Amino acid sequence: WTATSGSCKGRCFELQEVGPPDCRCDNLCKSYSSCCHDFDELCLKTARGWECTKDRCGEVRNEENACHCSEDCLSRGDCCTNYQVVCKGESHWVDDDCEEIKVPECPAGFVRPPLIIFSVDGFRASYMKKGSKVMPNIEKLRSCGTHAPYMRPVYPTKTFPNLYTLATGLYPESHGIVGNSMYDPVFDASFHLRGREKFNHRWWGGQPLWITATKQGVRAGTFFWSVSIPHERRILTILQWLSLPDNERPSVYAFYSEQPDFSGHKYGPFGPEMTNPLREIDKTVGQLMDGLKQLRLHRCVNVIFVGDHGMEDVTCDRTEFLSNYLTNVDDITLVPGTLGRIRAKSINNSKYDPKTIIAALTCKKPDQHFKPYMKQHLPKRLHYANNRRIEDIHLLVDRRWHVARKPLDVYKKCFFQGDHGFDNKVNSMQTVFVGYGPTFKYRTKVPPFENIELYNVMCDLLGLKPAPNNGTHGSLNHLLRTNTFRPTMPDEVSRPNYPGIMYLQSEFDLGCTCDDKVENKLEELNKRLHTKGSTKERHLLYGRPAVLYRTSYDILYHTDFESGYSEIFLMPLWTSYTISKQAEVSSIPEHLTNCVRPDVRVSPGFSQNCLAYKNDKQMSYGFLFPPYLSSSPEAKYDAFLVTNMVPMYPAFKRVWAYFQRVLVKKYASERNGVNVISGPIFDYNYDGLRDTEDEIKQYVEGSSIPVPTHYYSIITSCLDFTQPADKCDGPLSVSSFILPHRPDNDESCNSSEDESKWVEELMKMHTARVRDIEHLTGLDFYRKTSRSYSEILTLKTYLHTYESEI
Ligand SMILES: *[C@@H]1O[C@H](CO)[C@@H](O[C@@H]2O[C@H](CO)[C@@H](O[C@@H]3O[C@H](CO[C@H]4O[C@H](CO)[C@@H](O)[C@H](O[C@H]5O[C@H](CO)[C@@H](O)[C@H](O)[C@@H]5O[C@H]5O[C@H](CO)[C@@H](O)[C@H](O)[C@@H]5O)[C@@H]4O)[C@@H](O)[C@H](O[C@H]4O[C@H](CO)[C@@H](O)[C@H](O)[C@@H]4O[C@H]4O[C@H](CO)[C@@H](O)[C@H](O)[C@@H]4O)[C@@H]3O)[C@H](O)[C@H]2NC(C)=O)[C@H](O)[C@H]1NC(C)=O
Ligand SMILES: Cc1cc(OC(F)(F)F)ccc1COC(=O)N1CCn2nc(C(=O)N3CCc4[nH]nnc4C3)cc2C1
Ligand SMILES: [Ca+2]
Ligand SMILES: [Ca+2]
Ligand SMILES: [Cl-]
Ligand SMILES: [K+]
Ligand code: NA
Ligand SMILES: [Zn+2]
């Protein structure tokens, strides 16, 4: 109940929320049906429109007007945004040349430049160029401030997951808003767009910017605007808030536009009807900037123009129906659309089997426009698994398509021409970023980055300490003129051992054999130096990774590669090697096909053994430094050391072998040498973070040899590819992947064909940031380069997406 008998007199858009049943006057009351009787009358005035006209100038203050052109309006802070242009001969902000804002130019009593976030729903990245003619205000912001060609949203590329990611710096899996629709089995409760349950605090995890500000004494305008409140009114309210007394005035503000998303759903991303909503957004930006200029705040405030996601073409006829695949269609609940989430309709149904559901959806039709996954097998880059609200079964839907349960669900629930929600690597889903203000750089283009990074920066902009989040703090320092955050490299927790030769061949009983018994200080003084690390400068280019957790490991040196070998996990945590453009691919000699050799630097008790692999009918093995890339017949024997061995399903060996035999050389050719760091990943609880030994759910049979869930590689070269990887004088270029270590190739529908038709495509799907690999391994890469740490942080957040140009 709300006793709405009180009044909004003088309380219009009050910054503090009074406790019911007292009537409210804040910009959220509409969505609660708790506004005072007079809210519309007093707080939502519309009389006379939004602009001053020539004959309104100098008028007598008439309180019924939506905004004012009277003389006292500046002091009252409630002029129409175009007042000075019409009545005082001022020019529009857009018509002014831009001038570098070297320092905040703020009125007395402003303790810090305010931050205004102007967020636009469905603003596809390519609108910046494609709509440039009809958006002069946005275009000045863009070219005069700091801009990226695009900003990468989070998966799923829906509104609430993305806006809440912007506000928290967290992946949906951590903030909890994992879709526009959700079921939480622990609450036994459902979250919906329409409805009231979504206003319950328990859905919303992490700590959004407005709470971070508030707890640290920085006042915030409210972020959520009711749909019925017109854009012009939202602008004037922000401007009014900015005219408040120093002690009452917020420092951070948000504006939100439902457009161009709203129109985009109806008309498609480039429907002719899209021009108008883009003009209108630009007009709103103009009004904000004119209002700021009126208040002498246009060289004081930092403005962020940011979208949540793009928009793709999607029509009713491009819909896959689960009823064309499943006989048991009525025993499942589907969260439908641009992604699919499946669970059992009833928990009392013990005949529901996810395994057989997945099988029935796997490569069943030639051009099938969705792919089923168990959530832990989704590409790690999506970070979409560690939350009880994410169903075990997931469908990644092809761009331009929908998935639905039954045809009736489509024609009884074509309407739409656009939608979004797809994989966050899809060009059509990319959105925008522009920063303009004293704290951002002048006329600067920055590389694309992820929206998870913005929280940190908005914290920097407001002098706040960010709550723990998924951004990498410092990776966006190159956006900022000042207020940079100077991060320091994490301290190494474990130091390596450096074992020499300590064991005789005969101390090993591993059931391994090798045809290697063939024999001179020419080639023996030489091989000593290689095992002490004489070629280490070539194969270990950026210093050894640091181990950021407590463990026992050995640095092992070799002619062709260096490794950090875990005595705990019985394999390298990392294997580093350099392949020059000139390097040659050889095959494995017939006599050495099954060759595995004990490593005399490492005890039998800390080694794998061949027997376990013989007994395990499911599990074979591969090597991290590839035998094919050995520098010499003699060097090749090193690649067969038991300490270079890792467990691999035969199905995965097809993938790995093609990577090592074909792709590494190809990348070396194309990139002028590559440095490769490869290794295992263990993430059995799919939390994106390195497993402790007690979290491993699978071993090679009859052994303590743990089975990785994934294999990674980080592939680094010179950004200036006219320089070789091993002699680079400037910025680096990287591409990485985290390949799932699976017993089958069910994910690849073409896998019965040659590796040259499917493997690289799989790898591309599982592209990763070095930073993702850091979370998963507890290692820290690039410790010793000539590059600034901030640039390295940027490099570590880079994702090679394999899409076309935007
Ligand atoms: C992206 O960034 C985020 C933020 O940094 C990273 O997430 C953090 O990871 C930490 C490590 O996993 C984790 O720390 C744990 O916190 C536990 C208490 O956490 C509560 O309090 C915090 C602070 O206010 C709060 O943020 C948490 O909020 C979570 O849960 C609520 C309610 O469920 C949600 O509203 C909210 O959205 C959030 O949910 C998410 O996180 C939880 C895990 O906390 C997931 O389960 C969800 O799926 C969802 O993703 C909490 O309210 C604390 O109890 C933990 O301590 C246990 O483990 C340590 C190991 O060191 C051990 O020493 C302790 O003894 C203890 O073990 C006991 O519990 C075990 C399990 O129940 C049991 O087995 C043992 O026997 C013991 O009894 C731990 O310290 C931190 O909470 C999250 N923070 C957030 C916001 O998610 C994330 O990792 C980053 N991602 C990547 C890829 O880098
Ligand atoms: C939470 C945050 C952080 C920001 O930025 C940051 F945190 F990054 F700083 C910015 C804004 C915000 C919040 O934004 C808002 O004010 N609202 C949240 C989004 N929202 N959606 C609606 C809605 O009902 N629909 C509009 C879209 C649409 N299209 N078709 N149908 C619909 C139906 C109303 C609102 C109000
Ligand atoms: Ca949206
Ligand atoms: Ca884990
Ligand atoms: Cl969803
Ligand atoms: K085997
Ligand atoms: Na297959
Ligand atoms: Zn939408």
Curated annotation (Swiss-Prot):
Glycans are attached at residues 3, 348, 360, 470, 750. Residues 541-806 are annotated as: Nuclease-like domain. Keywords: Calcium, Chemotaxis, Cleavage on pair of basic residues, Disulfide bond, Glycoprotein, Hydrolase, Lipid degradation, Lipid metabolism, Metal-binding, Obesity, Repeat, Secreted, Signal, Zinc. 1-tetradecanoyl-sn-glycerol 3-phosphate binds at residues 159, 180, 261, 420. Binds 2 Zn(2+) ions per subunit. Residues 773-794 are annotated as: Required for secretion. InterPro entries: Alkaline_phosphatase_core_sf (IPR017850), DNA/RNA_non-sp_Endonuclease_sf (IPR044929), Endo_G_ENPP1-like_dom (IPR001604), ENPP1-3/EXOG-like_nuc-like (IPR020821), His-Me_finger_sf (IPR044925), Phosphodiest/P_Trfase (IPR002591), SMB_chordata (IPR020436), Somatomedin_B-like_dom_sf (IPR036024). Inhibited by vanadate. Inhibited by micromolar levels of bile salts, such as tauroursodeoxycholate. Not inhibited by taurodeoxycholate. Not inhibited by hydroxysterols, such as 7-hydroxycholesterol, testosterone, dexamethasone and prednisolone. Inhibited by EDTA and EGTA. Zn(2+) 1 binds at residues 121, 159, 308-309. PROSITE patterns: SMB_1, SMB_2. It catalyses: a 1-O-alkyl-sn-glycero-3-phosphoethanolamine + H2O = a 1-O-alkyl-sn-glycero-3-phosphate + ethanolamine + H(+); a 1-acyl-sn-glycero-3-phosphoethanolamine + H2O = a 1-acyl-sn-glycero-3-phosphate + ethanolamine + H(+); 1-(9Z-octadecenoyl)-sn-glycero-3-phosphoethanolamine + H2O = 1-(9Z-octadecenoyl)-sn-glycero-3-phosphate + ethanolamine + H(+); a 1-O-alkyl-sn-glycero-3-phosphocholine + H2O = a 1-O-alkyl-sn-glycero-3-phosphate + choline + H(+). The record marks 796 as: Essential for catalytic activity. 1-(9Z-octadecenoyl)-sn-glycero-3-phosphate binds at residues 159, 180, 261, 420. Disulfide bonds join 8-25, 12-43, 23-36, 29-35, 52-69, 57-87, 67-80, 73-79, 98-144, 106-300, 316-414, 363-749, 512-610, 514-595, 718-728. Residues 94-447 are annotated as: Phosphodiesterase. GO terms for cellular component: extracellular space; membrane. It is found in: Secreted. Residues 4-47, 48-92 form the SMB domain. Abundantly expressed in cerebrum and cerebellum. Localized in secretory epithelial cells in the brain and the eye including choroid plexus epithelial cells, ciliary epithelial cells, iris pigment epithelial cells, and retinal pigment cells. This is Autotaxin.
